[PDB]
CSV table of C-alpha atoms and ligand atoms in Angstrom, one decimal:
chain,number,residue,atom,x,y,z
A,5,UNK,CA,0.0,0.0,0.0
A,6,UNK,CA,2.7,2.5,-0.8
A,7,UNK,CA,2.5,4.0,-4.3
A,8,UNK,CA,4.5,7.0,-5.4
A,9,UNK,CA,6.7,8.9,-3.0
A,10,UNK,CA,5.6,12.1,-1.4
A,11,UNK,CA,8.1,14.8,-0.3
A,12,UNK,CA,6.5,17.4,1.9
A,13,UNK,CA,8.3,19.4,4.7
A,14,UNK,CA,10.8,16.6,5.2
A,15,UNK,CA,8.9,13.4,5.6
A,16,UNK,CA,9.3,10.3,3.6
A,17,UNK,CA,5.8,9.2,2.6
A,18,UNK,CA,3.9,7.6,-0.1
A,19,UNK,CA,0.4,8.0,-1.7
A,20,UNK,CA,-2.1,5.6,-0.2
A,21,UNK,CA,-2.9,2.8,-2.7
A,22,UNK,CA,-5.2,-0.2,-2.0
A,23,UNK,CA,-6.9,1.4,1.0
A,24,UNK,CA,-9.5,4.1,1.5
A,25,UNK,CA,-8.0,7.4,2.9
A,26,UNK,CA,-8.3,8.1,6.7
A,27,UNK,CA,-8.7,11.9,7.1
A,28,UNK,CA,-7.9,13.0,10.6
A,29,UNK,CA,-10.5,14.7,12.8
A,30,UNK,CA,-10.3,18.5,13.0
A,31,UNK,CA,-11.1,20.6,16.0
A,32,UNK,CA,-11.7,19.7,19.6
A,33,UNK,CA,-14.3,18.1,21.8
A,34,UNK,CA,-13.3,20.5,24.6
A,35,UNK,CA,-15.2,23.8,25.2
A,36,UNK,CA,-15.4,26.4,27.9
A,37,UNK,CA,-17.9,26.3,30.7
A,38,UNK,CA,-19.6,29.7,30.6
A,39,UNK,CA,-19.4,32.1,33.6
A,40,UNK,CA,-16.3,30.6,35.1
A,41,UNK,CA,-14.5,33.2,37.3
A,42,UNK,CA,-10.9,33.9,36.4
A,43,UNK,CA,-9.4,32.6,39.7
A,44,UNK,CA,-10.5,29.1,38.7
A,45,UNK,CA,-8.7,29.3,35.3
A,46,UNK,CA,-5.3,27.6,34.8
A,47,UNK,CA,-4.1,28.5,31.3
A,48,UNK,CA,-4.4,25.1,29.7
A,49,UNK,CA,-5.8,25.0,26.1
A,50,UNK,CA,-6.8,22.3,23.6
A,51,UNK,CA,-4.1,20.8,21.5
A,52,UNK,CA,-6.0,21.8,18.4
A,53,UNK,CA,-6.2,25.6,19.0
A,54,UNK,CA,-7.8,26.0,15.5
A,55,UNK,CA,-8.4,29.6,14.5
A,56,UNK,CA,-7.4,30.7,18.1
A,57,UNK,CA,-3.7,30.2,17.1
A,58,UNK,CA,-2.7,33.3,15.1
A,59,UNK,CA,-0.4,31.4,12.7
A,60,UNK,CA,-2.5,30.4,9.7
A,61,UNK,CA,0.1,27.7,8.7
A,62,UNK,CA,-0.6,25.7,11.9
A,63,UNK,CA,-3.2,23.5,10.2
A,64,UNK,CA,-3.8,19.9,11.2
A,65,UNK,CA,-2.0,18.3,8.3
A,66,UNK,CA,1.1,20.5,8.7
A,67,UNK,CA,1.1,19.8,12.5
A,68,UNK,CA,0.8,16.1,12.1
A,69,UNK,CA,3.5,16.0,9.4
A,70,UNK,CA,5.8,18.0,11.7
A,71,UNK,CA,5.3,15.6,14.6
A,72,UNK,CA,5.8,12.6,12.3
A,73,UNK,CA,9.2,13.8,11.2
A,74,UNK,CA,10.6,12.9,14.6
A,75,UNK,CA,9.6,9.3,14.2
A,76,UNK,CA,11.5,9.1,10.9
A,77,UNK,CA,14.7,10.1,12.5
A,78,UNK,CA,17.4,7.4,13.0
A,79,UNK,CA,17.2,5.9,16.5
A,80,UNK,CA,19.9,6.6,19.2
A,81,UNK,CA,20.7,3.0,19.9
A,82,UNK,CA,21.2,0.5,17.1
A,83,UNK,CA,21.5,-2.4,19.4
A,84,UNK,CA,21.0,-3.2,23.1
A,85,UNK,CA,24.1,-3.3,25.3
A,86,UNK,CA,25.3,-5.4,28.2
A,87,UNK,CA,23.5,-3.4,30.9
A,88,UNK,CA,20.2,-3.6,29.0
A,89,UNK,CA,20.9,-7.3,28.6
A,90,UNK,CA,21.4,-7.5,32.4
A,91,UNK,CA,18.2,-5.7,33.0
A,92,UNK,CA,16.3,-8.1,30.6
A,93,UNK,CA,17.4,-11.0,32.7
A,94,UNK,CA,15.8,-9.3,35.7
A,95,UNK,CA,12.4,-8.8,33.9
A,96,UNK,CA,12.5,-12.4,32.6
A,97,UNK,CA,13.1,-13.7,36.1
A,98,UNK,CA,10.4,-11.5,37.5
A,99,UNK,CA,7.8,-12.9,35.0
A,100,UNK,CA,9.0,-16.5,35.2
A,101,UNK,CA,8.6,-16.4,38.9
A,102,UNK,CA,5.2,-14.6,38.6
A,103,UNK,CA,3.9,-17.3,36.2
A,104,UNK,CA,5.5,-20.1,38.2
A,105,UNK,CA,7.1,-21.4,35.0
A,106,UNK,CA,3.6,-22.0,33.4
A,107,UNK,CA,2.9,-20.4,30.0
A,108,UNK,CA,-0.1,-18.1,29.7
A,109,UNK,CA,-2.8,-19.4,27.4
A,110,UNK,CA,-3.9,-17.6,24.4
A,111,UNK,CA,-7.5,-16.4,24.5
A,112,UNK,CA,-9.7,-17.7,21.7
A,113,UNK,CA,-11.3,-15.1,19.4
A,114,UNK,CA,-14.5,-14.3,21.4
A,115,UNK,CA,-12.6,-13.7,24.6
A,116,UNK,CA,-10.1,-11.5,22.9
A,117,UNK,CA,-12.7,-9.3,21.1
A,118,UNK,CA,-14.5,-9.0,24.4
A,119,UNK,CA,-11.5,-7.2,25.9
A,120,UNK,CA,-11.6,-4.4,23.4
A,121,UNK,CA,-13.6,-1.5,24.6
A,122,UNK,CA,-16.7,-0.6,22.6
A,123,UNK,CA,-15.6,3.0,22.2
A,124,UNK,CA,-12.5,2.6,20.1
A,125,UNK,CA,-12.0,3.4,16.5
A,126,UNK,CA,-11.4,0.3,14.4
A,127,UNK,CA,-8.2,1.5,12.8
A,128,UNK,CA,-7.3,2.4,9.3
A,129,UNK,CA,-9.1,-0.4,7.4
A,130,UNK,CA,-12.6,-0.3,9.0
A,131,UNK,CA,-14.4,3.1,9.5
A,132,UNK,CA,-16.2,4.2,12.6
A,133,UNK,CA,-15.9,2.7,16.1
A,134,UNK,CA,-16.0,-1.0,17.2
A,135,UNK,CA,-19.6,-0.4,18.5
A,136,UNK,CA,-20.7,0.9,15.1
A,137,UNK,CA,-20.3,-2.6,13.8
A,138,UNK,CA,-21.5,-4.7,16.8
A,139,UNK,CA,-25.0,-3.4,17.3
A,140,UNK,CA,-27.6,-6.2,17.7
A,141,UNK,CA,-25.3,-8.4,19.8
A,142,UNK,CA,-23.5,-9.6,16.7
A,143,UNK,CA,-20.8,-8.2,14.4
A,144,UNK,CA,-21.8,-6.7,11.0
A,145,UNK,CA,-20.4,-8.0,7.7
A,146,UNK,CA,-17.5,-5.6,7.2
A,147,UNK,CA,-15.9,-6.0,10.6
A,148,UNK,CA,-16.4,-9.8,10.6
A,149,UNK,CA,-14.7,-10.1,7.1
A,150,UNK,CA,-11.7,-8.1,8.3
A,151,UNK,CA,-11.4,-9.9,11.6
A,152,UNK,CA,-11.7,-13.4,10.1
A,153,UNK,CA,-8.9,-12.6,7.7
A,154,UNK,CA,-6.6,-11.2,10.3
A,155,UNK,CA,-7.3,-14.1,12.6
A,156,UNK,CA,-6.7,-16.7,9.9
A,157,UNK,CA,-3.5,-15.1,8.8
A,158,UNK,CA,-2.2,-14.7,12.4
A,159,UNK,CA,-3.0,-18.3,13.2
A,160,UNK,CA,-0.8,-19.4,10.3
A,161,UNK,CA,2.0,-17.5,12.0
A,162,UNK,CA,2.6,-14.9,9.4
A,163,UNK,CA,2.8,-11.2,10.6
A,164,UNK,CA,0.1,-8.7,10.1
A,165,UNK,CA,0.3,-5.2,8.7
A,166,UNK,CA,1.4,-3.0,11.6
A,167,UNK,CA,-0.6,0.0,10.3
A,168,UNK,CA,-2.3,2.7,12.3
A,169,UNK,CA,-4.6,5.7,11.4
A,170,UNK,CA,-2.9,9.0,12.1
A,171,UNK,CA,-4.4,12.0,13.8
A,172,UNK,CA,-3.9,14.6,16.6
A,173,UNK,CA,-4.6,13.6,20.1
A,174,UNK,CA,-7.5,15.8,21.5
A,175,UNK,CA,-6.3,16.9,24.9
A,176,UNK,CA,-5.6,19.9,27.1
A,177,UNK,CA,-2.0,21.2,27.0
A,178,UNK,CA,-0.3,24.1,28.7
A,179,UNK,CA,0.3,27.4,26.8
A,180,UNK,CA,3.6,26.5,25.1
A,185,UNK,CA,5.2,22.9,18.7
A,186,UNK,CA,5.4,19.3,19.8
A,187,UNK,CA,1.9,17.8,20.1
A,188,UNK,CA,0.9,14.1,20.7
A,189,UNK,CA,-0.2,12.1,17.7
A,190,UNK,CA,-3.0,9.6,17.6
A,191,UNK,CA,-2.0,6.0,16.6
A,192,UNK,CA,-5.3,4.4,16.0
A,193,UNK,CA,-4.7,0.7,15.9
A,194,UNK,CA,-6.1,-1.7,13.3
A,195,UNK,CA,-8.8,-3.8,15.1
A,196,UNK,CA,-7.3,-7.0,13.7
A,197,UNK,CA,-3.9,-6.4,15.3
A,198,UNK,CA,-5.8,-5.5,18.5
A,199,UNK,CA,-7.8,-8.7,18.7
A,200,UNK,CA,-4.8,-10.9,17.9
A,201,UNK,CA,-2.6,-9.1,20.4
A,202,UNK,CA,-5.3,-9.3,23.0
A,203,UNK,CA,-5.5,-13.1,22.5
A,204,UNK,CA,-1.7,-13.3,23.1
A,205,UNK,CA,-1.1,-10.8,25.8
A,206,UNK,CA,-4.2,-10.5,27.9
A,207,UNK,CA,-3.7,-13.4,30.4
A,208,UNK,CA,-0.1,-12.4,31.3
A,209,UNK,CA,-1.2,-8.7,31.6
A,210,UNK,CA,-4.2,-9.7,33.8
A,211,UNK,CA,-1.7,-11.4,36.1
A,212,UNK,CA,0.5,-8.3,36.0
A,213,UNK,CA,-2.4,-6.0,36.9
A,214,UNK,CA,-3.2,-8.1,40.1
A,215,UNK,CA,0.3,-7.6,41.2
A,216,UNK,CA,0.7,-4.0,40.2
A,217,UNK,CA,0.8,-2.7,43.8
A,218,UNK,CA,4.1,-4.5,44.2
A,219,UNK,CA,5.5,-3.4,40.8
A,220,UNK,CA,7.7,-2.5,39.2
A,221,UNK,CA,5.0,-2.3,36.5
A,222,UNK,CA,2.3,-0.1,37.9
A,223,UNK,CA,-0.3,-0.6,35.2
A,224,UNK,CA,-3.6,-1.5,36.9
A,225,UNK,CA,-2.8,0.2,40.2
A,226,UNK,CA,-5.6,2.1,42.0
A,227,UNK,CA,-4.3,5.4,43.3
A,228,UNK,CA,-7.3,5.8,45.5
A,229,UNK,CA,-6.7,2.6,47.5
A,230,UNK,CA,-4.4,0.6,49.8
A,231,UNK,CA,-2.3,0.2,46.6
A,232,UNK,CA,-0.7,3.6,47.5
A,233,UNK,CA,0.4,2.3,50.9
A,234,UNK,CA,2.1,-0.8,49.4
A,235,UNK,CA,3.8,1.4,46.8
A,236,UNK,CA,5.2,3.8,49.4
A,237,UNK,CA,6.2,1.2,52.1
A,238,UNK,CA,8.0,-0.7,49.3
A,239,UNK,CA,10.0,2.4,48.3
A,240,UNK,CA,11.1,3.1,51.8
A,241,UNK,CA,11.8,-0.6,52.5
A,242,UNK,CA,15.3,-0.3,51.2
A,243,UNK,CA,16.1,3.4,51.0
A,244,UNK,CA,15.4,6.9,52.4
A,245,UNK,CA,16.2,8.9,49.3
A,246,UNK,CA,14.1,8.8,46.1
A,247,UNK,CA,13.9,10.0,42.5
A,248,UNK,CA,10.9,11.2,40.6
A,249,UNK,CA,11.2,11.4,36.8
A,250,UNK,CA,9.2,12.2,33.8
A,251,UNK,CA,10.4,12.1,30.2
A,252,UNK,CA,9.9,14.4,27.2
A,253,UNK,CA,9.4,13.0,23.8
A,254,UNK,CA,9.4,9.4,25.1
A,255,UNK,CA,7.2,7.6,22.6
A,256,UNK,CA,8.6,9.5,19.7
A,257,UNK,CA,12.3,8.6,20.3
A,258,UNK,CA,12.2,5.1,21.7
A,259,UNK,CA,14.7,2.8,19.9
A,260,UNK,CA,13.4,-0.3,18.0
A,261,UNK,CA,16.0,-2.6,19.7
A,262,UNK,CA,14.6,-1.7,23.1
A,263,UNK,CA,10.9,-2.0,22.0
A,264,UNK,CA,11.7,-5.3,20.3
A,265,UNK,CA,13.4,-6.6,23.5
A,266,UNK,CA,10.4,-5.6,25.6
A,267,UNK,CA,8.0,-7.5,23.2
A,268,UNK,CA,10.3,-10.6,23.3
A,269,UNK,CA,10.4,-10.4,27.1
A,270,UNK,CA,6.6,-10.1,27.4
A,271,UNK,CA,6.0,-13.0,25.1
A,272,UNK,CA,8.5,-15.3,26.8
A,273,UNK,CA,6.0,-16.7,29.2
A,274,UNK,CA,3.1,-16.8,26.7
A,275,UNK,CA,1.8,-20.0,25.1
A,276,UNK,CA,4.1,-20.6,22.1
A,277,UNK,CA,1.6,-20.9,19.3
A,278,UNK,CA,1.6,-19.6,15.8
A,279,UNK,CA,-0.7,-16.7,16.8
A,280,UNK,CA,1.9,-15.6,19.4
A,281,UNK,CA,4.6,-15.9,16.7
A,282,UNK,CA,2.5,-13.7,14.5
A,283,UNK,CA,1.8,-11.1,17.1
A,284,UNK,CA,5.4,-10.8,18.2
A,285,UNK,CA,6.5,-10.5,14.5
A,286,UNK,CA,3.8,-7.8,13.9
A,287,UNK,CA,4.4,-5.5,16.8
A,288,UNK,CA,8.2,-5.8,16.4
A,289,UNK,CA,8.1,-4.4,12.9
A,290,UNK,CA,8.6,-0.7,12.0
A,291,UNK,CA,5.0,0.7,12.4
A,292,UNK,CA,3.4,2.6,9.6
A,293,UNK,CA,0.5,5.1,9.8
A,294,UNK,CA,-2.0,6.6,7.4
A,295,UNK,CA,-2.4,10.3,7.6
A,296,UNK,CA,-5.0,11.1,4.9
A,297,UNK,CA,-4.3,9.8,1.4
A,298,UNK,CA,-0.7,9.3,2.6
A,299,UNK,CA,1.0,6.4,4.3
A,300,UNK,CA,4.1,7.1,6.5
A,301,UNK,CA,6.8,4.7,7.6
A,302,UNK,CA,8.8,5.0,10.8
A,303,UNK,CA,12.4,4.4,12.0
A,304,UNK,CA,12.1,4.8,15.8
A,305,UNK,CA,9.4,5.2,18.5
A,306,UNK,CA,6.6,3.3,20.1
A,307,UNK,CA,3.1,4.1,18.9
A,308,UNK,CA,0.9,5.0,22.0
A,309,UNK,CA,-1.9,3.1,20.5
A,310,UNK,CA,0.0,-0.2,20.2
A,311,UNK,CA,-2.0,-2.9,21.9
A,312,UNK,CA,-0.6,-3.0,25.5
A,313,UNK,CA,1.4,0.2,25.1
A,314,UNK,CA,1.5,0.8,28.8
A,315,UNK,CA,3.0,-2.5,29.8
A,316,UNK,CA,5.5,-2.7,26.9
A,317,UNK,CA,6.4,0.9,27.5
A,318,UNK,CA,6.8,0.0,31.2
A,319,UNK,CA,9.2,-2.8,30.3
A,320,UNK,CA,11.3,-0.3,28.2
A,321,UNK,CA,11.5,2.0,31.2
A,322,UNK,CA,12.5,-0.9,33.5
A,323,UNK,CA,15.2,-1.9,31.0
A,324,UNK,CA,16.5,1.6,30.5
A,325,UNK,CA,16.4,2.8,34.1
A,326,UNK,CA,18.0,-0.4,35.3
A,327,UNK,CA,20.7,-0.3,32.6
A,328,UNK,CA,21.6,3.4,33.3
A,329,UNK,CA,22.3,2.5,37.0
A,330,UNK,CA,24.2,-0.7,36.0
A,331,UNK,CA,26.3,1.3,33.6
A,332,UNK,CA,27.1,3.9,36.2
A,333,UNK,CA,28.1,1.2,38.6
A,334,UNK,CA,30.4,-0.4,36.0
A,335,UNK,CA,32.3,3.0,35.4
A,336,UNK,CA,33.0,3.3,39.1
A,337,UNK,CA,34.2,-0.3,39.2
A,338,UNK,CA,31.2,-1.8,40.8
A,339,UNK,CA,29.0,-4.7,39.7
A,340,UNK,CA,25.4,-3.8,40.4
A,341,UNK,CA,22.5,-6.2,40.1
A,342,UNK,CA,18.9,-7.0,40.8
A,343,UNK,CA,17.9,-3.3,41.0
A,344,UNK,CA,14.2,-3.9,41.2
A,345,UNK,CA,14.7,-6.0,44.3
A,346,UNK,CA,17.6,-4.1,46.0
A,347,UNK,CA,16.2,-0.6,45.2
A,348,UNK,CA,12.4,-1.0,44.5
A,349,UNK,CA,11.1,1.2,41.7
A,350,UNK,CA,7.9,1.7,39.9
A,351,UNK,CA,7.2,2.4,36.3
A,352,UNK,CA,4.0,3.4,34.3
A,353,UNK,CA,5.0,4.3,30.7
A,354,UNK,CA,7.3,7.3,30.8
A,355,UNK,CA,6.4,7.9,34.4
A,356,UNK,CA,8.6,6.5,37.2
A,357,UNK,CA,9.5,6.7,40.8
A,358,UNK,CA,12.7,5.1,42.1
A,359,UNK,CA,14.3,4.4,45.5
A,360,UNK,CA,17.8,5.9,45.7
A,361,UNK,CA,20.5,4.0,47.6
A,362,UNK,CA,23.3,6.1,49.0
A,363,UNK,CA,25.6,4.8,46.2
A,364,UNK,CA,22.9,5.7,43.6
A,365,UNK,CA,22.5,9.2,45.0
A,366,UNK,CA,26.2,9.6,44.6
A,367,UNK,CA,25.9,8.2,41.0
A,368,UNK,CA,23.0,10.5,40.1
A,369,UNK,CA,24.9,12.8,37.6
A,370,UNK,CA,26.3,9.7,35.8
A,371,UNK,CA,22.9,8.0,35.8
A,372,UNK,CA,21.1,10.9,34.1
A,373,UNK,CA,23.8,11.1,31.5
A,374,UNK,CA,23.5,7.3,30.9
A,375,UNK,CA,19.8,7.9,30.5
A,376,UNK,CA,20.7,10.6,27.9
A,377,UNK,CA,23.1,8.3,26.1
A,378,UNK,CA,20.2,5.8,25.7
A,379,UNK,CA,18.3,8.5,23.9
A,380,UNK,CA,15.9,9.5,26.7
A,381,UNK,CA,15.3,13.0,27.8
A,382,UNK,CA,14.8,12.9,31.6
A,383,UNK,CA,13.2,15.8,33.5
A,384,UNK,CA,12.3,16.2,37.1
A,385,UNK,CA,8.7,15.2,38.0
A,386,UNK,CA,8.3,18.4,40.0
A,387,UNK,CA,8.1,20.4,36.7
A,388,UNK,CA,9.7,23.5,38.4
A,389,UNK,CA,13.1,22.4,39.6
A,390,UNK,CA,16.1,20.6,38.1
A,391,UNK,CA,16.6,16.9,38.6
A,392,UNK,CA,17.6,16.1,42.1
A,393,UNK,CA,16.7,13.6,44.8
A,394,UNK,CA,13.3,14.3,46.5
A,395,UNK,CA,12.5,13.1,50.0
A,396,UNK,CA,9.5,11.0,51.2
A,397,UNK,CA,7.2,14.0,51.8
A,398,UNK,CA,7.9,15.3,48.3
A,399,UNK,CA,7.6,12.3,46.1
A,400,UNK,CA,5.5,12.5,42.9
A,401,UNK,CA,4.0,9.7,40.8
A,402,UNK,CA,1.2,9.6,38.2
A,403,UNK,CA,0.4,13.3,38.6
A,404,UNK,CA,-0.2,12.8,42.3
A,405,UNK,CA,1.6,13.8,45.5
A,406,UNK,CA,1.1,12.0,48.8
A,407,UNK,CA,0.3,12.6,52.5
A,408,UNK,CA,0.4,10.3,55.5
A,409,UNK,CA,-3.1,10.3,57.1
A,410,UNK,CA,-4.9,8.2,59.9
A,411,UNK,CA,-6.5,6.3,57.0
A,412,UNK,CA,-3.0,5.3,55.7
A,413,UNK,CA,-1.4,7.0,52.8
A,414,UNK,CA,-3.5,9.4,50.6
A,415,UNK,CA,-3.0,10.7,47.0
A,416,UNK,CA,-3.8,14.1,45.7
A,417,UNK,CA,-4.1,15.0,42.0
A,418,UNK,CA,-2.3,18.2,41.3
A,419,UNK,CA,-4.6,21.1,42.0
A,420,UNK,CA,-4.5,22.4,38.4
A,421,UNK,CA,-5.9,19.0,37.1
A,422,UNK,CA,-8.9,19.5,39.5
A,423,UNK,CA,-9.3,23.2,38.6
A,424,UNK,CA,-9.3,22.6,34.8
A,425,UNK,CA,-12.2,20.2,35.1
A,426,UNK,CA,-14.2,23.3,36.2
A,427,UNK,CA,-12.9,25.5,33.3
A,428,UNK,CA,-13.2,22.9,30.5
A,429,UNK,CA,-15.7,20.2,29.6
A,430,UNK,CA,-15.3,17.4,27.1
A,431,UNK,CA,-18.4,18.0,24.9
A,432,UNK,CA,-19.7,15.5,22.3
A,433,UNK,CA,-19.4,18.0,19.3
A,434,UNK,CA,-16.3,19.2,17.5
A,435,UNK,CA,-15.4,22.9,18.1
A,436,UNK,CA,-13.2,24.7,15.6
A,437,UNK,CA,-12.1,27.3,18.1
A,438,UNK,CA,-12.0,28.0,21.9
A,439,UNK,CA,-15.5,28.9,22.8
A,440,UNK,CA,-18.1,28.4,25.4
A,441,UNK,CA,-20.8,25.6,25.6
A,442,UNK,CA,-24.2,25.2,27.1
A,443,UNK,CA,-24.7,21.5,26.3
A,444,UNK,CA,-23.6,20.7,29.9
A,445,UNK,CA,-26.7,18.9,31.2
A,446,UNK,CA,-25.3,15.5,30.7
A,447,UNK,CA,-24.9,12.5,33.2
A,448,UNK,CA,-21.2,12.1,32.4
A,449,UNK,CA,-20.5,15.7,33.5
A,450,UNK,CA,-22.5,15.0,36.6
A,451,UNK,CA,-20.5,12.0,37.7
A,452,UNK,CA,-17.3,13.9,36.9
A,453,UNK,CA,-18.3,16.9,39.1
A,454,UNK,CA,-19.3,14.7,42.0
A,455,UNK,CA,-16.0,12.8,41.7
A,456,UNK,CA,-14.2,16.1,41.5
A,457,UNK,CA,-15.4,16.8,45.1
A,458,UNK,CA,-13.7,13.6,46.4
A,459,UNK,CA,-10.6,14.6,44.5
A,460,UNK,CA,-10.6,18.1,46.0
A,461,UNK,CA,-11.4,16.8,49.6
A,462,UNK,CA,-7.9,15.3,49.7
A,463,UNK,CA,-6.4,18.8,49.7
A,464,UNK,CA,-8.2,20.0,52.7
A,465,UNK,CA,-11.5,21.8,53.6
A,466,UNK,CA,-10.3,25.2,52.3
A,467,UNK,CA,-9.5,23.9,48.8
A,468,UNK,CA,-12.7,21.8,48.9
A,469,UNK,CA,-14.7,25.0,49.7
A,470,UNK,CA,-13.0,26.9,46.9
A,471,UNK,CA,-13.9,24.2,44.3
A,472,UNK,CA,-17.4,23.7,45.7
A,473,UNK,CA,-18.2,27.5,45.4
A,474,UNK,CA,-17.8,27.1,41.7
A,475,UNK,CA,-19.5,23.7,41.6
A,476,UNK,CA,-22.6,25.2,43.3
A,477,UNK,CA,-22.8,27.7,40.4
A,478,UNK,CA,-22.5,24.9,37.8
A,479,UNK,CA,-25.6,23.1,39.4
A,480,UNK,CA,-27.7,25.3,37.2
A,481,UNK,CA,-25.9,23.8,34.2
A,482,UNK,CA,-25.6,20.2,35.3
A,483,UNK,CA,-27.8,17.9,37.3
A,484,UNK,CA,-25.4,16.8,40.1
A,485,UNK,CA,-24.9,16.7,43.9
A,486,UNK,CA,-22.7,18.8,46.1
A,487,UNK,CA,-21.5,16.8,49.1
A,488,UNK,CA,-20.3,18.3,52.4
A,489,UNK,CA,-16.6,18.1,53.3
A,490,UNK,CA,-17.2,15.3,55.8
A,491,UNK,CA,-19.3,13.3,53.2
A,492,UNK,CA,-16.5,13.5,50.6
A,493,UNK,CA,-13.9,12.7,53.3
A,494,UNK,CA,-15.9,9.5,54.1
A,495,UNK,CA,-15.7,8.5,50.5
A,496,UNK,CA,-11.9,8.6,50.5
A,497,UNK,CA,-11.8,6.5,53.6
A,498,UNK,CA,-14.3,4.0,52.2
A,499,UNK,CA,-12.2,3.7,49.0
A,500,UNK,CA,-9.2,2.6,51.1
A,501,UNK,CA,-9.7,0.0,53.9
B,601,LIG,MN1,6.6,13.3,29.6
B,602,LIG,MN1,4.8,10.9,32.0
């Protein structure tokens, strides 16, 4: 499905042949709640500013093309080294011990399809969402044709087309031109990968509180306590990192190793063989009538992105320390055990041993030399160690209460839910909306109270003062401070 080469702004692309075009969705679902006082505003804006961005050139196709260029750059690492190889042995030993040596069964078709959520686009080959083809309990003709072919091919062990549908992620971003792309996965790759990786990932999700892979953790529960106790079980210094341009710069050799590691304890069938071969191949994406090939990166819509990304992080964080130990003449090993750490995509929190604190400059540089761009989680200061009462993970800070440990979403994330609302219609600019009397907004604004309560009565009151004004716009309840506080407590215990 590549025809004749395109050359526009510096991307290597081709005219889409053999498939229908997949035009990206313009505009944004987000719109402004009317009458919001200025003290509640935080400065965030939709990623697709539209005609609210003065530069006329900043059109969707240009923006997407600009952000795709990055993925066509040659990767930092061409091959994995000895420290990443050491770290891979750790992950392998963690999984082999988790699974008790037993291989995880493939799901059959029905079970795998059932794991896909109804509201997901079907990828570049089938229009609409999953649910637009599975109405009266059964699949329609188009989806079934496509899914039977993919399933047949995959069970013969041959790889599938690792193709996605391109677009701009519709989300709120600060006032600063990098912007996240949408990698809408082909439904056939999705079902096949779900058949192969769901059982091992279900097992990982149960054991998420212990980590290192945090995918599945519940930041509102006792999970938080086991996360924190574990961090302080071996150290009294910590590191909180986030990474810029993570997805877009990931090296194939690392991604490929992550996939091999995750499939190691899977049932060794032809379907697994096919899924491994598919996800390991350089992913392509269809912008409109153009198909674009990549040279680096991990598509954030790859089936099981979070876990696979989390293995990459484990590999790279553990190698960076191991490399830094080697330079000082030390052999370091078993990092995840000796210095417990957690990982959720590009987000991580690590225990720092005295030796590791001393090796901090060399570790950040070793992270740089693997192609990553580390930054402090506390998005204000430089990278340094941060104490117990300062740790940050998954946009949440922590506080030791009588009901164990308690997590607080950063105040801005709460506040922006008062300023913005994810409407069901596309807006071509920043503007206000009155279509706010929806059940989904209601459950969001009641939940927002439980979120705010964690910051104290004064913040709760500040938020509720605006929430009480929005009760004319949305059918919902405003709890008392005590009532909300009882909900946090109930969610733990
Ligand atoms: Mn980041
Ligand atoms: Mn992050």
